[PDB]
Write an enzyme that holds these catalytic residues in place. Structure first.
Site, PDB file in Angstrom:
ATOM      1  N   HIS A   5       0.619  -1.283   0.354  1.00 16.21           N
ATOM      2  CA  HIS A   5       0.124  -0.432   0.328  1.00 16.21           C
ATOM      3  C   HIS A   5       0.627   2.002  -0.032  1.00 16.21           C
ATOM      4  CE1 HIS A   5       0.159  -0.867   4.530  1.00 16.21           C
ATOM      5  NE2 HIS A   5       0.328   0.412   4.730  1.00 16.21           N
TER       6      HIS A   5
ATOM      7  N   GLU B 224      -3.054  13.930   1.358  1.00 15.12           N
ATOM      8  CA  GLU B 224      -4.786  13.351   2.188  1.00 15.12           C
ATOM      9  C   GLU B 224      -5.197  14.692   2.700  1.00 15.12           C
ATOM     10  OE1 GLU B 224      -3.025   8.974   4.725  1.00 15.12           O
ATOM     11  OE2 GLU B 224      -4.367   8.631   2.970  1.00 15.12           O
TER      12      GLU B 224
ATOM     13  N   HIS C 198       6.310   7.504   5.246  1.00 11.66           N
ATOM     14  CA  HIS C 198       5.766   6.275   4.119  1.00 11.66           C
ATOM     15  C   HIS C 198       4.821   8.255   3.121  1.00 11.66           C
ATOM     16  CE1 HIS C 198       3.287   6.844   7.242  1.00 11.66           C
ATOM     17  NE2 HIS C 198       2.050   6.798   6.426  1.00 11.66           N
TER      18      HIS C 198
ATOM     19  N   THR D  16      -4.658   7.205   8.146  1.00 10.51           N
ATOM     20  CA  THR D  16      -5.742   7.113   7.184  1.00 10.51           C
ATOM     21  C   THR D  16      -5.081   5.938   6.833  1.00 10.51           C
ATOM     22  OG1 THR D  16      -3.818   8.388   5.837  1.00 10.51           O
ATOM     23  CG2 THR D  16      -4.494   9.893   7.449  1.00 10.51           C
TER      24      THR D  16
ATOM     25  N   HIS E 200       1.477   9.203   0.023  1.00  9.57           N
ATOM     26  CA  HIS E 200       0.669   8.818  -0.811  1.00  9.57           C
ATOM     27  C   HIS E 200       0.882   9.967  -1.866  1.00  9.57           C
ATOM     28  CE1 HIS E 200      -1.021   6.951   2.998  1.00  9.57           C
ATOM     29  NE2 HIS E 200      -0.565   8.207   3.521  1.00  9.57           N
TER      30      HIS E 200
ATOM     31  N   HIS F  28       4.496  11.088   5.196  1.00  9.20           N
ATOM     32  CA  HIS F  28       3.576  11.956   6.794  1.00  9.20           C
ATOM     33  C   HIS F  28       5.591  10.778   7.409  1.00  9.20           C
ATOM     34  CE1 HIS F  28      -0.467  10.658   5.350  1.00  9.20           C
ATOM     35  NE2 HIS F  28      -0.221  12.464   6.105  1.00  9.20           N
TER      36      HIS F  28
END
Ligand SMILES: [Hg+2]
Ligand SMILES: [Zn+2]
Length: 255
Positions: free
Chosen positions: A60, A102, A90, A194, A92, A115
């Site tokens: 992910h 996010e 990590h 999240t 997103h 993050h």
């Protein structure tokens, strides 16, 4: 659980009912609604003596893990009480540069979001920390597309190595300080993870000022795989969750 049409964010509530909780993340940061709180102390980030260990594709996202057996890389001050140790970071990202972040600012969405996860050391381990309302501290940084970020290339170059789900690679002597913006102005609010298990244990600290990365930099992220090695190829793109209801909660500004 994933980000597909059948296992995406809209379906998480089934396996994780907290999805519909009272302090879920991310949120939309209304810059005019946020509260300038003068009692907010400055952020204190000590990452000088940080020890990077490895990078892994967990299906992910890709995480860079740090040695958190001692107060090596700590976050303190700001809205926080005590010390939080960095355990990993990590990102997103989106499929395009017009989505990815996010958290949104006045509804504006960024190309990516960084993050840095920290855990309150009075709780002794990460495992125990995720059982407290004040267990974790997340440092959120928005990434825009522009100039290349020298400090991010080391990561960019190693991604060829952790293409599929499950792969991991040694990744030592990586200095996180290279990922920080000039300014430490931030927004803070009580939230959650999240991603499943969407635990409501996080004090979110979102920096006002974004870092810019180059298109070729973010492009390498999009080349990643959700799938495991030797399975139908599913590009790791849009691994973000839509903004949630603030629901009473107040967002404070350090500026
Ligand atoms: Hg919690
Ligand atoms: Zn995250």
């Amino acid at each position: 659980w994933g980000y597909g049409k059948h296992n995406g964010p809209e379906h998480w509530h089934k396996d994780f009912p907290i999805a519909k909780g009272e302090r879920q993340s991310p949120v939309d940061i209304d810059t005019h609604t946020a509260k300038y709180d003068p009692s907010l102390k400055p952020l204190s980030v000590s990452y000088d003596q940080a020890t990077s260990l490895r990078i892994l594709n967990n299906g992910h996202a890709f995480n860079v893990e740090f040695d958190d057996s001692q107060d090596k890389a700590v976050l303190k001050g700001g809205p926080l009480d005590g010390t939080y140790r960095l355990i990993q970071f990590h990102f997103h990202w989106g499929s395009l540069d017009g989505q990815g972040s996010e958290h949104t600012v006045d509804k504006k969405k960024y190309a990516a979001e960084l993050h840095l996860v920290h855990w309150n050391t009075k709780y002794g381990d990460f495992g125990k920390a995720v059982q407290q309302p004040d267990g974790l501290a997340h440092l959120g940084i928005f990434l825009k597309v522009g100039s290349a970020k020298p400090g991010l290339q080391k990561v960019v170059d190693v991604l060829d190595s952790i293409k599929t789900k499950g792969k991991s690679a040694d990744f030592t002597n990586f200095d996180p300080r290279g990922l920080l913006p000039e300014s430490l102005d931030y927004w803070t609010y009580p939230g959650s993870l999240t991603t499943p298990p969407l635990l409501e244990c996080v004090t979110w600290i979102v920096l006002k000022e974004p870092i810019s990365v180059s298109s070729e930099q973010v492009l390498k992220f999009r080349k990643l795989n959700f799938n495991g090695e030797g399975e139908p190829e599913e590009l790791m793109v849009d691994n973000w969750r839509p903004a949630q209801p603030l629901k009473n909660r107040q967002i404070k500004a350090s500026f």
